[PDB]
Design a protein around this ligand. Structure first.
Ligand SMILES: CSc1ccccc1CC(=O)N1CCC(F)(F)[C@H](C(N)=O)C1
Ligand SMILES: [Zn+2]
Length: 139
């Protein structure tokens, strides 16, 4: 679990979005595993606008933050689940680090702010859905 609260927006993993999120839908993309819903209260997370390949993510299965090097956002193949058939997930960045299902939603940050959220993992790897290209979140 976990979300990004920026202005009048809430960003979550699409596979974990609630009935409230769907009844206040702004945008969603299955290929990215993202869903953005509207909020009445003002969010104070800052989104980074950079090309950083290093940062820190929160890992709930260890109650710890870890520093990581991560790849540039790309199309990476992801195996079937109760949420999605076998497919390429776009805007995904991989890093060598611990993750378990339950860690999805953990924020990844660099010195410029919020980079993205945990969305995939396994085999000593962790995948993050990038949010830095969604320029409309600030405006
Ligand atoms: C941190 S997720 C993780 C970690 C270790 C091992 C396994 C997982 C689970 C995982 O990779 N999934 C299941 C959930 C999901 F939303 F459908 C993901 C996706 N974005 O398609 C794929
Ligand atoms: Zn950065």
């Amino acid at each position: 679990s976990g979300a990004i609260y920026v202005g009048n927006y809430r960003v979550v993993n699409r596979h974990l979005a609630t009935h409230n999120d769907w009844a206040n839908l702004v945008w969603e993309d299955s290929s990215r595993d993202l869903l953005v819903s509207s909020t009445t209260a003002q969010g104070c997370d800052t989104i980074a606008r950079c090309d950083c390949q290093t940062g820190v993510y929160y890992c709930s299965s260890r109650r710890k933050h870890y520093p990581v090097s991560f790849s540039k956002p790309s199309l990476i193949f992801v195996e079937a689940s109760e949420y999605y058939p076998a497919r390429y997930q776009s805007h995904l960045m991989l890093a060598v680090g611990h993750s378990e299902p339950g860690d999805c939603g953990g924020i990844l940050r660099c010195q410029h702010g919020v980079v993205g959220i945990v969305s995939t993992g396994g085999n000593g790897l962790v995948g993050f859905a990038d949010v830095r290209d969604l320029l409309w979140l600030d405006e």
